[PDB]
Design a protein around this motif. Structure first.
Motif, PDB file in Angstrom:
ATOM      1  N   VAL A 182       0.858  -1.231  -0.033  1.00 20.04           N
ATOM      2  CA  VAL A 182       0.002  -0.002   0.135  1.00 20.04           C
ATOM      3  C   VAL A 182       0.911   1.146   0.088  1.00 20.04           C
ATOM      4  O   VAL A 182       2.009   1.302   0.433  1.00 20.04           O
ATOM      5  N   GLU A 183       0.289   2.288  -0.627  1.00 22.61           N
ATOM      6  CA  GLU A 183       1.206   3.537  -0.281  1.00 22.61           C
ATOM      7  C   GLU A 183       1.211   3.902   0.933  1.00 22.61           C
ATOM      8  O   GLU A 183       0.459   3.723   1.654  1.00 22.61           O
ATOM      9  N   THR A 184       2.672   4.501   1.238  1.00 23.64           N
ATOM     10  CA  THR A 184       2.831   5.177   2.575  1.00 23.64           C
ATOM     11  C   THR A 184       1.692   6.050   2.914  1.00 23.64           C
ATOM     12  O   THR A 184       1.412   6.984   1.986  1.00 23.64           O
ATOM     13  N   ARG A 185       1.169   6.044   4.193  1.00 24.85           N
ATOM     14  CA  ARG A 185       0.004   6.849   4.539  1.00 24.85           C
ATOM     15  C   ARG A 185       0.192   7.751   5.719  1.00 24.85           C
ATOM     16  O   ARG A 185       0.963   7.198   6.562  1.00 24.85           O
ATOM     17  N   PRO A 186      -0.279   8.927   5.815  1.00 22.73           N
ATOM     18  CA  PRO A 186      -0.204   9.601   7.051  1.00 22.73           C
ATOM     19  C   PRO A 186      -1.116   8.997   8.258  1.00 22.73           C
ATOM     20  O   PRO A 186      -2.408   8.719   8.023  1.00 22.73           O
ATOM     21  N   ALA A 187      -0.393   8.859   9.526  1.00 21.33           N
ATOM     22  CA  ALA A 187      -1.369   8.801  10.562  1.00 21.33           C
ATOM     23  C   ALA A 187      -2.271   9.730  11.147  1.00 21.33           C
ATOM     24  O   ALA A 187      -3.018   9.597  12.008  1.00 21.33           O
ATOM     25  N   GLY A 188      -1.742  11.164  10.977  1.00 22.81           N
ATOM     26  CA  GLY A 188      -2.345  12.269  11.249  1.00 22.81           C
ATOM     27  C   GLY A 188      -1.747  12.922  12.669  1.00 22.81           C
ATOM     28  O   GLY A 188      -2.303  14.017  13.090  1.00 22.81           O
ATOM     29  N   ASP A 189      -0.582  12.245  13.159  1.00 30.61           N
ATOM     30  CA  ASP A 189       0.111  12.737  14.228  1.00 30.61           C
ATOM     31  C   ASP A 189       1.600  13.001  13.965  1.00 30.61           C
ATOM     32  O   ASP A 189       2.286  13.000  14.630  1.00 30.61           O
ATOM     33  N   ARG A 190       1.853  13.337  12.639  1.00 38.47           N
ATOM     34  CA  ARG A 190       2.898  13.500  11.787  1.00 38.47           C
ATOM     35  C   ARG A 190       3.979  12.279  11.679  1.00 38.47           C
ATOM     36  O   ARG A 190       5.202  12.433  11.163  1.00 38.47           O
ATOM     37  N   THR A 191       3.291  11.294  12.022  1.00 41.29           N
ATOM     38  CA  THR A 191       4.032   9.966  11.611  1.00 41.29           C
ATOM     39  C   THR A 191       3.332   9.126  10.601  1.00 41.29           C
ATOM     40  O   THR A 191       2.060   9.662  10.144  1.00 41.29           O
ATOM     41  N   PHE A 192       3.971   7.927  10.046  1.00 39.91           N
ATOM     42  CA  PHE A 192       3.347   7.365   8.909  1.00 39.91           C
ATOM     43  C   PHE A 192       3.402   5.947   8.903  1.00 39.91           C
ATOM     44  O   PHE A 192       3.742   5.413  10.076  1.00 39.91           O
ATOM     45  N   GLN A 193       2.741   5.430   8.168  1.00 39.55           N
ATOM     46  CA  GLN A 193       2.244   3.740   8.144  1.00 39.55           C
ATOM     47  C   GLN A 193       2.455   3.139   6.790  1.00 39.55           C
ATOM     48  O   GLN A 193       2.154   3.925   5.701  1.00 39.55           O
ATOM     49  N   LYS A 194       2.771   1.890   6.789  1.00 41.76           N
ATOM     50  CA  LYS A 194       2.855   1.138   5.503  1.00 41.76           C
ATOM     51  C   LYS A 194       2.584  -0.250   5.809  1.00 41.76           C
ATOM     52  O   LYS A 194       2.577  -0.849   7.005  1.00 41.76           O
ATOM     53  N   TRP A 195       1.833  -1.072   4.942  1.00 43.15           N
ATOM     54  CA  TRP A 195       2.091  -2.480   5.099  1.00 43.15           C
ATOM     55  C   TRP A 195       2.325  -3.310   3.783  1.00 43.15           C
ATOM     56  O   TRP A 195       2.060  -2.653   2.724  1.00 43.15           O
ATOM     57  N   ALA A 196       2.891  -4.272   3.802  1.00 46.56           N
ATOM     58  CA  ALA A 196       3.116  -5.265   2.677  1.00 46.56           C
ATOM     59  C   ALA A 196       2.387  -6.377   2.938  1.00 46.56           C
ATOM     60  O   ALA A 196       2.623  -7.222   4.159  1.00 46.56           O
ATOM     61  N   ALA A 197       1.907  -7.246   2.058  1.00 46.43           N
ATOM     62  CA  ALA A 197       1.191  -8.338   2.437  1.00 46.43           C
ATOM     63  C   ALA A 197       1.386  -9.524   1.019  1.00 46.43           C
ATOM     64  O   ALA A 197       1.764  -9.073  -0.071  1.00 46.43           O
TER      65      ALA A 197
END
Lengths: 100, 9, 275
Positions: free
Chosen positions: C231-246
């Motif tokens: 998935v595209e790297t996405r913002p968490a909304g607290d100035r950090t980010f999230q990603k996952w691979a499956a």
């Protein structure tokens, strides 16, 4: 002109824990032009207190926005993101799935 | 801060 | 480490609905710290990161004056662009600009940036040598010949090599660790059965900063690139980010797969399994 369809991801700021306050996120990206409508849905109904980030764009010039609201997930409550854009013939609805 | 020189395309 | 400052301008004409809308956002690294919106009730630059709220009202007043002059400049650019492409006054159009500077840990310029897009496509950009232009088409060549004859690239070079770097240097000083420190991902693997003989292994990275990261799945040490879903790297909304691979795995073979996680905040990459 060349228009681009929004990509949509629906997810939570912290791992979803029933009963604990959290944030519901809808990230819309890769779209052009910039006008877009995004609603967060709680059991099919529009949620009222929804904020969003300032309009920004990526290196490829496509726009992105984060829409968010505080929420306390439960086991049966359903949450979704609904998007309207000139590229879309119908609103695009993406259901929140806490495993994604 | 934003730059204060301006350019017409 | 290295750092960057960038401003992102968007101007959108609204035929028969008033003057074009102008929006700006400012960034240090992956941290947004200012914004301006001409459609606000009293348009004014506004802070968006904690370390910039210290600036006095002269800072915000000065920058507001500049954005208003920029917005009027973009209006004229949009009117010229409409003539270059034989478009109507009835059509809505978009001018996007981005400029700024990259510096190394020594604080001196590494690369300058100064580029434009019209209606979502590249239009003209200043090249890395900060003396020549790359135009995307014949209309952008009208602009290119204008800016050469006026020798305006030398002006741009001076701002990018000078003032840009000095503002970045000062913003890095205000920010301290909120800009210097990388936050490593919190990582874990989840397991989602599809059916007999198939389950999804999802490798998660959460709460990381900056946004750059690499997630890969390997089977017995060999990459699974054509079969990994990212998935595209996405913002968490607290100035950090999230990603996952499956990856989809044969049921009972979950322990053949490793997930590898590379990020600035991890001296050594992480290797993760479902266990």
């Amino acid at each position: 002109m060349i228009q681009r369809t929004p990509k949509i991801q629906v997810y939570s700021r912290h791992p979803a824990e029933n009963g604990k306050s959290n944030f519901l996120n809808c990230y819309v990206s890769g779209f052009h032009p910039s006008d877009i409508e995004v609603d967060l849905l709680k059991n099919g109904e529009r949620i009222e207190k929804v904020e969003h980030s300032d309009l920004s764009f990526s290196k490829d010039w496509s726009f992105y926005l984060l829409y968010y609201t505080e929420f306390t997930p439960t086991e049966k409550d359903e949450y979704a993101c609904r998007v309207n854009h000139v590229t879309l013939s119908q609103p695009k609805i993406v259901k929140w799935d806490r495993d994604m | 801060s934003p730059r204060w020189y301006f350019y017409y395309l | 480490g290295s750092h960057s400052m960038r401003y992102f301008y968007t101007s959108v004409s609204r035929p028969g609905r008033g003057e074009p809308r102008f929006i700006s956002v400012g960034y240090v690294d992956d941290t947004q710290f200012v914004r301006f919106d001409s459609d606000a009730a009293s348009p004014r630059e506004e802070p968006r990161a904690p370390w910039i709220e210290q600036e006095g009202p002269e800072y915000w007043d000065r920058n507001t004056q500049i954005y208003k002059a920029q917005a009027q400049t973009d209006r004229e650019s949009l009117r010229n662009l409409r003539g270059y492409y034989n478009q109507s006054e009835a059509g809505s159009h978009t001018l996007q600009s981005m400029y700024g500077c990259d510096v190394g840990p020594d604080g001196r310029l590494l690369r300058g940036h100064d580029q434009y897009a019209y209606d979502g496509k590249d239009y003209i950009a200043l090249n890395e040598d900060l003396r020549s232009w790359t135009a995307a088409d014949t209309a952008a060549q009208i602009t290119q010949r204008k800016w050469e004859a006026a020798r305006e690239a030398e002006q741009r070079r001076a701002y990018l090599e000078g003032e840009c770097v000095e503002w970045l240097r000062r913003y890095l000083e205000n920010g301290k660790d909120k800009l210097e420190r990388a936050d490593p991902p919190k990582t874990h693997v989840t397991h989602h059965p599809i059916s007999d003989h198939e389950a999804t292994l999802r490798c998660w990275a959460l709460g990381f900063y900056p946004a750059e990261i690499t997630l890969t799945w390997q089977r017995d040490g060999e990459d699974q690139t054509q079969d990994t879903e990212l998935v595209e790297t996405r913002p968490a909304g607290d100035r950090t980010f999230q990603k996952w691979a499956a990856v989809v795995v044969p049921s009972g073979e979950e322990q053949r797969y490793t997930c590898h996680v590379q990020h600035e905040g991890l001296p050594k990459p992480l290797t993760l399994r479902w266990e």
